[PDB]
Design an enzyme around this catalytic site. Structure first.
Site, short mmCIF file in Angstrom:
data_model
loop_
_atom_site.label_atom_id
_atom_site.label_comp_id
_atom_site.label_asym_id
_atom_site.label_seq_id
_atom_site.Cartn_x
_atom_site.Cartn_y
_atom_site.Cartn_z
N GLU A 147 -3.19 -9.41 -36.82
CA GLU A 147 -2.70 -9.69 -35.44
C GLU A 147 -1.19 -9.49 -35.34
O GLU A 147 -0.72 -8.95 -34.34
CB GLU A 147 -3.19 -11.05 -34.94
CG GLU A 147 -4.68 -11.00 -34.58
CD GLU A 147 -5.33 -12.14 -33.81
OE1 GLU A 147 -6.49 -12.57 -34.24
OE2 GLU A 147 -4.75 -12.58 -32.76
N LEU A 205 6.08 -9.41 -6.18
CA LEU A 205 6.26 -9.17 -7.64
C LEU A 205 7.73 -8.88 -7.98
O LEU A 205 8.19 -9.37 -9.01
CB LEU A 205 5.37 -8.01 -8.10
CG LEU A 205 3.87 -8.28 -8.10
CD1 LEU A 205 3.14 -7.04 -8.58
CD2 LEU A 205 3.53 -9.46 -8.98
N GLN A 253 -11.95 -13.02 -20.41
CA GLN A 253 -12.41 -14.42 -20.31
C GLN A 253 -11.37 -15.22 -19.53
O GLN A 253 -11.78 -16.08 -18.74
CB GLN A 253 -12.72 -15.01 -21.68
CG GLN A 253 -13.90 -14.30 -22.32
CD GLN A 253 -14.47 -14.91 -23.58
OE1 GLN A 253 -15.67 -14.77 -23.80
NE2 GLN A 253 -13.65 -15.50 -24.45
N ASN A 299 -1.49 -19.47 -28.19
CA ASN A 299 -2.78 -20.18 -28.35
C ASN A 299 -2.55 -21.49 -29.12
O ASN A 299 -3.29 -22.43 -28.85
CB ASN A 299 -3.84 -19.29 -28.98
CG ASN A 299 -4.74 -18.63 -27.96
OD1 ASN A 299 -4.69 -18.95 -26.75
ND2 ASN A 299 -5.55 -17.70 -28.43
N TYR A 356 -12.46 -21.55 -26.51
CA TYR A 356 -11.84 -20.63 -25.53
C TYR A 356 -12.07 -21.15 -24.11
O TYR A 356 -11.18 -20.97 -23.28
CB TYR A 356 -12.39 -19.21 -25.70
CG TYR A 356 -11.88 -18.52 -26.94
CD1 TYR A 356 -12.72 -17.74 -27.72
CD2 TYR A 356 -10.56 -18.66 -27.34
CE1 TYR A 356 -12.24 -17.06 -28.84
CE2 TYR A 356 -10.08 -18.04 -28.48
CZ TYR A 356 -10.92 -17.24 -29.23
OH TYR A 356 -10.40 -16.61 -30.33
N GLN A 383 -11.38 -8.96 -24.73
CA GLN A 383 -12.09 -10.24 -24.62
C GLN A 383 -11.18 -11.30 -23.99
O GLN A 383 -11.62 -11.93 -23.05
CB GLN A 383 -12.63 -10.72 -25.96
CG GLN A 383 -13.21 -12.12 -25.86
CD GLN A 383 -13.83 -12.60 -27.15
OE1 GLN A 383 -14.71 -11.99 -27.70
NE2 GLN A 383 -13.37 -13.70 -27.68
N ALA A 384 -9.97 -11.49 -24.51
CA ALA A 384 -9.09 -12.58 -24.05
C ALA A 384 -8.74 -12.34 -22.59
O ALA A 384 -8.78 -13.29 -21.78
CB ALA A 384 -7.85 -12.68 -24.92
N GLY A 436 -5.82 -8.56 -30.49
CA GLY A 436 -7.00 -7.70 -30.56
C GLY A 436 -6.62 -6.22 -30.51
O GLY A 436 -5.52 -5.90 -30.02
N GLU A 449 10.29 -10.13 -6.76
CA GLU A 449 11.08 -11.38 -6.70
C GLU A 449 10.96 -12.11 -8.05
O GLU A 449 11.96 -12.71 -8.45
CB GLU A 449 10.66 -12.15 -5.45
CG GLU A 449 11.58 -13.31 -5.12
CD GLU A 449 11.27 -14.04 -3.83
OE1 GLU A 449 10.52 -13.45 -2.97
OE2 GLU A 449 11.78 -15.21 -3.68
#
Ligand SMILES: Nc1nc2c(ncn2[C@@H]2O[C@H](COP(=O)(O)OP(=O)(O)OP(=O)(O)O)[C@@H](O)[C@H]2O)c(=O)[nH]1
Ligand SMILES: Nc1ncnc2c1ncn2[C@@H]1O[C@H](COP(=O)(O)OP(=O)(O)CP(=O)(O)O)[C@@H](O)[C@H]1O
Ligand SMILES: Nc1nc2c(ncn2[C@@H]2O[C@H](COP(=O)(O)OP(=O)(O)O)[C@@H](O)[C@H]2O)c(=O)[nH]1
Ligand SMILES: [Ca+2]
Ligand SMILES: [Ca+2]
Ligand SMILES: [Ca+2]
Ligand SMILES: [Cl-]
Ligand SMILES: [Mg+2]
Ligand SMILES: [Mg+2]
Ligand SMILES: [Mg+2]
Lengths: 421, 439, 32, 342
Positions: free
Chosen positions: B183, B252, B15, B206, B224, B11-12, B143, B254
């Site tokens: 978590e 990437l 989104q 968060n 969110y 989900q995180a 999650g 670098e």
């Protein structure tokens, strides 16, 4: 994670089950013929959790109605929402169970159970992705108690990776039908400890005391008790039935609420208590008050392992967060320090004939008081083998009662262990 | 030109990817249908924006992106939302039941059944790349899918693309918006399994974003949507060097060279300024000196910690808008005489500076005011180990009683994996102390 | 205070400022 | 109800602050490992500052400044004074000090030790750590080997009459969450009960003025004053009668200057002004006075105890200005501040 299959067993199970479906059908805008006449898309978004869709946009409860006598299911069929249930989902014998766990579990119930599983399988087979099962029953009678726990054992055998949830009505001498209730309840608790993931302990002692002391009902009826049960059941299933982040399915609730597999017996609470305008501070203080708990346990006599709080109605999410933090910060000693952040809060915009309400679900070590009370009533009779002949007559031995008593005393010790830790 | 593939997990991750790709489309002039009028080479090209976007013959610019979730409801909102035409259906992967906030369920039980399908969809994007640089992986620590599926995927990507850089954007759990008591378990298990497979990981607490939204955007109770629009600004600051012409953090590789001299200490602290309310009808515009000084305020960090009480190994300043090197160098001189900026002895005391002249884009109707200049500081400081110390403590409280461990064992994980993951975090905390503290 | 590696283009510039000098498991193992 | 935890059982100051908080009835003590506190009375070593200020709905305050150890360890204080432009190598109120390991400053210490030999200057030094006095370099360095600092020893201390006896001054200073610097108006002189003897450093009872050393070894403990403790009212009378000045003019201007210089120097490094948690700390500053009435800082204590008769007043002071300022319920201090223009 999507469909739940609901089973209601025996007189109590079917009376509280029927009220559950009346109450949540009204919340989801479903009328007694199964037609949707509501005003919000929030009502239909997760309707499939509890309802099947039929021909002509009809909604049919995913509900199986079970009893060993027809009487209470005839009354359901005549009751206001009686025509909404699928007719093939009524499964009943003629014998009854005589308030005898052994008849429900071993003799009469054994004869009926296969035809109940045929209906469970039919409901389960058309599920996109079954989450699991909820059973409504009492522990004090014979069908709900004995046949209910038989069904749970058989459902687990066929669906061992699915969640099993019960609403279990615990008996009280204050609201009693027979002297053998403590026997039936001890034998049932032994089954629930092994074969459910989550059990809501609905104590007839607590419901009676709320009706008498708080609601000022001089003579509480089963109808008055069931008004409290149906409001609690609507409250504790809000997160399953409406869009939301927290405890939105049975497995996520279990993972948040059950730190040890056997300690899965929850003390539900509700505010405000009802037979005009409540503030968020007042909801929060009342939902945590001993007098609003549906299990007759003093939460100040134990510690909270885990809590779920659900607020319903249009209110300030900031004020809900502040008040929920206020309760924990001011009463910090009653929340175990070895499960950090053990209180989770959900807010749903749709209220239940109220502007706002709060439902409380607690995993408290104080629940041991309920099991000790049943244990004391069991022993007082069992030490003289009183009323045992009703059970030995159906093929049971004394040893099965000794094992159930020991397992329930072990459960009490385990709550005591985490209370002292 | 060298392609990057973005992978959004759970989900995180999904989104936040929605918010990032919305913002990328606005930054590059790409419409919701995929058309980009300013792009004169139809059907292909090797412009800087082609690192993140492929092109069809019909002029459609398609994100080099895979979205994975173990339940369908979040990715179904991408499938039917504003940017639905941007993504081909095979980029959007969903299962039927989620990992129920359980690392073991994500990694072992459900991961094993969907991992070959996800690698097949990634292989399809990789096959359209002429020079794939590697992967940007967006997920939560908290999650079951974000933690458990991501760590399986990172292991399999090391096997199938052994020479490719992997960068993470990781959401660190905060109780003000968290949905699970476990978590901290999921965070330590995923950090342990992922640590050898990630080249550079940007953690976002968060709690920090929540407080920035409350304090600086006057949002009473951030959602969110609020958090993700702010996170997407910071991600866009970090990836802008890959998507636009420039000479700093242009590949990437670098990122590792500039920010990570020690492979295990690969968690740079991001600090972003300024964050200003769109509803604020009167705003005095902040100078280069003011936004640069704000990079040394804990209140502007993506993780709350105190860099005065650690050591720097590396510092990059990524400016967007009306900024010239003269004003940057004067800002830095003033800050050096006033702040506690201590580098380790074996690193030069210095800043790599990037300036993109295009000011920060904002999403119309969003919470962020349009500003004339902004900066993201990426600093590798030992102070970020405070966030590991917090998580390790919560882990220890619960694990001492074996609280919730039966849910993980029930998925076929061994209890030993908990104590092994925790020992790896103890060694990580110790590595930060050795680099950071004097004697 | 030395300003080095100054790179200019139409869309921005970059440089370095120095205030002081100094003082895997296989497919098989995963499947198993 | 504000909440607090206690993580240092051996602190007499905070045991008394703890008792005072409880007696207001508006403060509740929690178990030491409960995170839901307003106030941490913290442990001395490895206080977990990294776990403070991450409790939603709680304003959190701790009774230590992270990084204050730079001031309150002997080696750190010497380094901080030499290397901070605002204190400088040429600082006039700190004795010439060198850090010495068994990085190091041996060959810089010997170089300066030769300038005294060379010019016939008084060449006595003191080695100490977190104790020996000699005019011979190689005996100090031998002892260390058997982390330390060698500090010029003050050969011409001020001597109290009667008794021809040495002393040091303890000042208590409270720094609140806003970085106001409060000097407690009561200090204490820790006196020697032995006459001072400049030709015998081997005998350390007339040279070292600590409360433990005088209580055991000195055969005059309590002859002049209760404990070996002279308070400001008497010492001020003494300076008026004998030397024709005041405690304020001769000594306290210098003490206030030194406290303000030390704490303003580390403020950017330790301030909690813009931080997710807040700090206060009680410091003990230890001063020597020389015979010209010049004041020298000897050390800063990060966890001081108090004189027995001043516990009541100082601890009430700590709840008034440090705690109730942040957590209000339903002056004994001088505020050190100076805004000179130049
Ligand atoms: N910043 C931010 N955090 C989010 C978002 N969605 C979830 N989180 C955080 O992520 C954690 C929960 O993980 P999720 O990503 O929801 O879980 P998942 O990866 O979908 O895993 P399962 O649902 O367990 O299969 C918590 O710490 C949430 O606060 C989001 O959109 N933005
Ligand atoms: N440079 C110096 N010149 C003269 N006397 C000195 C001195 N340094 C220390 N002393 C003597 O030693 C005493 C302080 O020793 P020091 O402060 O190093 O020890 P300590 O830290 O145990 C004292 P506290 O209990 O206050 O912390 C002073 O009271 C003084 O008598
Ligand atoms: N709360 C409630 N309790 C009930 C109801 N009906 C019976 N009981 C209780 O349930 C127990 C008796 O079991 P019951 O369900 O009647 O027997 P069964 O039909 O054999 O399951 C006793 O504890 C009664 O107090 C009811 O409608 N509501
Ligand atoms: Ca029969
Ligand atoms: Ca092109
Ligand atoms: Ca690698
Ligand atoms: Cl490769
Ligand atoms: Mg009955
Ligand atoms: Mg999910
Ligand atoms: Mg000392």
């Amino acid at each position: 994670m999507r469909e739940i299959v609901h089973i209601q067993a025996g007189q109590c199970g079917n009376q509280i089950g029927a009220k559950f479906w009346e109450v949540i059908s009204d919340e989801h805008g479903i009328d007694p013929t199964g037609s949707y006449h509501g005003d919000s898309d929030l009502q239909l978004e997760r309707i499939n959790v509890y309802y099947n869709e039929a021909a002509g946009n009809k909604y049919v409860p995913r509900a199986i109605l079970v009893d060993l006598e027809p009487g209470t299911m005839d009354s359901v069929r005549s009751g206001p929402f009686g025509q909404i249930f699928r007719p093939d989902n009524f499964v009943f014998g003629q014998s009854g169970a005589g308030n005898n766990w052994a008849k429900g579990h071993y003799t009469e119930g054994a004869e009926l159970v296969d035809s109940v599983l045929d209906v469970v399988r039919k409901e389960s087979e058309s599920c996109d992705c079954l989450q699991g099962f909820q059973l409504t029953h009492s522990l004090g009678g014979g069908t709900g108690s004995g046949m209910g726990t038989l069904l749970i054992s058989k459902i687990r055998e066929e669906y061992p990776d699915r969640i099993m949830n019960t609403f279990s009505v615990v008996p009280s001498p204050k609201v009693s039908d027979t002297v053998v209730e403590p026997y039936n309840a001890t034998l049932s608790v032994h089954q629930l400890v092994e074969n459910t993931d989550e059990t809501y302990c609905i104590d007839n002692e607590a419901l009676y005391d709320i009706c008498f002391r708080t609601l000022k009902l001089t003579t509480p009826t089963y109808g008055d008790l069931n008004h409290l049960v149906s409001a609690t059941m609507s409250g504790v299933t809000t997160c399953l039935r409406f869009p939301g982040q927290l405890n939105a399915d049975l497995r996520k609730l279990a993972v948040n609420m059950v730190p040890f597999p056997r300690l899965h017996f929850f003390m539900p609470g509700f505010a405000p208590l009802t037979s005009r305008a409540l503030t968020v501070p007042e909801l929060t203080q009342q939902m945590f008050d001993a007098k609003n708990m549906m299990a007759a346990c003093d939460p100040r006599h134990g510690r909270y392992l885990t809590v779920a709080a659900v607020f319903r109605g249009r209110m300030s999410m900031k004020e809900v967060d502040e008040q929920m933090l206020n309760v924990q910060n001011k009463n910090s000693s009653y929340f175990v320090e070895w499960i950090p952040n053990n209180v989770k809060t959900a807010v749903c915009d749709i209220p239940p004939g109220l502007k706002m309400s709060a439902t409380f679900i607690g995993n408290s070590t104080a629940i041991q008081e309920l099991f000790k009370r049943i244990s004391e009533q069991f022993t007082a009779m069992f030490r003289r083998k009183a009323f045992l002949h009703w059970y030995t007559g159906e093929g049971m031995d004394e040893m099965e009662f000794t094992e159930a008593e020991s397992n329930m005393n072990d459960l009490v010790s385990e709550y005591q262990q985490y209370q002292d830790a | 030109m060298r392609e990057c593939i973005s992978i959004h997990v759970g989900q995180a991750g999904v989104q936040i990817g929605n918010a990032c790709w919305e913002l990328y489309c606005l930054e590059h002039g790409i419409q919701p249908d995929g058309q980009m009028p300013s792009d004169k080479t139809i059907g292909g090209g090797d412009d800087s924006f082609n690192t993140f976007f492929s092109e069809t013959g019909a002029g459609k610019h398609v994100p080099r992106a895979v979205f994975v979730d173990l339940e369908p409801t979040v990715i179904d909102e991408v499938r039917t939302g504003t940017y639905r035409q941007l993504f081909h259906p095979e980029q959007l992967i969903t299962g039927k039941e989620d990992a129920a906030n359980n690392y073991a369920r994500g990694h072992y039980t459900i991961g094993k059944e969907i991992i070959d399908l996800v690698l097949d969809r990634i292989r399809k994007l990789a096959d359209q790349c002429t020079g794939l640089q590697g992967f940007l992986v967006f997920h939560s620590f908290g999650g079951g899918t974000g933690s458990g599926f991501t760590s399986l995927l990172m292991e399999r990507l090391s096997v199938d693309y052994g020479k490719k850089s992997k960068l993470e954007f990781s959401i660190y759990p905060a109780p003000q918006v968290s949905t699970a008591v476990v978590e901290p378990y999921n965070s330590i298990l995923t950090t342990h399994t992922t640590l050898e497979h990630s080249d550079c990981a940007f953690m976002v607490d968060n709690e920090a974003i929540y407080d920035i939204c409350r304090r600086n955007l006057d949002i009473e109770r951030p959602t969110y949507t609020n958090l993700n629009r702010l996170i997407s600004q910071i991600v866009s600051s970090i990836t802008a060097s890959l998507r636009f012409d420039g000479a700093l953090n242009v590949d990437l590789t670098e990122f590792q060279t500039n920010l990570v001299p020690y492979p295990r200490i690969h968690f740079p602290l991001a600090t972003y300024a300024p964050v200003i309310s769109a509803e604020k009808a009167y705003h005095e515009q902040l100078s280069v000196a003011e936004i640069t000084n704000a990079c040394f305020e804990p209140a502007n960090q993506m993780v709350k910690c105190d860099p005065r009480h650690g050591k720097y190994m590396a510092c990059c300043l990524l400016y967007r808008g009306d900024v010239v090197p003269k004003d940057v160098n004067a800002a830095i001189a003033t800050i050096k005489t006033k702040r506690s900026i201590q580098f380790v002895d074996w690193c030069p005391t210095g800043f790599k500076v990037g300036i993109n002249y295009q000011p920060p884009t904002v999403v119309p109707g969003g919470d962020l005011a349009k500003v004339q200049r902004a900066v993201c500081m990426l600093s590798n400081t030992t102070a970020i180990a405070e966030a590991w110390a917090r998580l390790d403590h919560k882990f220890d409280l619960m694990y001492a009683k074996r609280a919730f461990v039966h849910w993980y064992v029930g998925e076929g994980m061994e209890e030993g994996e908990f104590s092994e993951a925790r020992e790896d975090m103890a060694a990580l905390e110790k590595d930060y102390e050795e680099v950071g503290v004097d004697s | 205070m030395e300003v080095i590696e100054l790179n200019k283009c139409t869309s921005g510039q970059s440089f370095e400022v120095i205030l002081k000098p100094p003082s895997d498991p296989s497919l098989e193992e995963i499947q198993k | 109800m504000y909440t607090f935890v206690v993580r240092d059982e051996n602190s007499s100051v905070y045991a008394e602050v703890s008792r005072l908080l409880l007696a207001t009835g508006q403060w509740k003590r929690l178990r030491k490992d409960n995170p839901r506190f307003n106030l941490m009375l913290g442990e001395r070593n490895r206080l977990p500052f990294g776990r403070l200020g991450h409790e939603p709905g709680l304003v959190q305050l701790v009774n230590y400044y992270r990084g204050a150890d730079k001031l309150c360890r002997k080696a750190s204080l010497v380094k901080l004074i030499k290397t901070s432009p605002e204190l400088s190598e040429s600082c006039t109120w700190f004795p010439e000090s060198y850090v010495i390991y068994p990085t190091d400053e041996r060959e810089v210490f010997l170089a300066a030790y030769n300038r005294r030999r060379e010019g016939r200057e008084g060449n006595v030094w003191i080695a100490k750590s977190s104790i020996l006095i000699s005019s011979e370099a190689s005996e100090l360095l031998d002892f260390i080997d058997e982390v330390h600092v060698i500090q010029k020893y003050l050969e011409k201390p001020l001597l109290l009459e009667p008794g021809h006896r040495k002393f040091d001054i303890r000042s208590w200073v409270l720094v609140d969450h806003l970085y106001n610097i409060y000097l407690y108006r009561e200090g204490v002189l820790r006196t020697s009960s032995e006459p001072y003897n400049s030709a015998n450093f081997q005998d350390k009872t007339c040279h070292l003025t600590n409360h433990c050393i005088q209580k055991e070894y000195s055969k005059n403990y309590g002859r002049y004053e209760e404990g070996n403790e002279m308070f400001f009212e008497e010492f001020n009378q003494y300076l008026m009668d004998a030397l024709n000045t005041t405690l304020e003019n001769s000594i306290l201007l210098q003490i206030k200057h030194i406290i303000r210089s030390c704490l303003m120097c580390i403020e950017p490094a330790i301030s909690t002004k813009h931080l997710h948690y807040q700090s206060f700390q009680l410091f003990g500053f230890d001063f020597m006075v020389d015979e010209e009435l010049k004041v020298w800082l000897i050390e800063v204590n990060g966890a001081p105890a108090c004189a027995q008769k001043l516990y009541a007043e100082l601890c009430q002071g700590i709840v008034d200005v440090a705690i109730s300022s942040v957590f209000p319920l339903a002056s004994i201090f001088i505020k050190l501040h100076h805004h000179h223009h130049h």
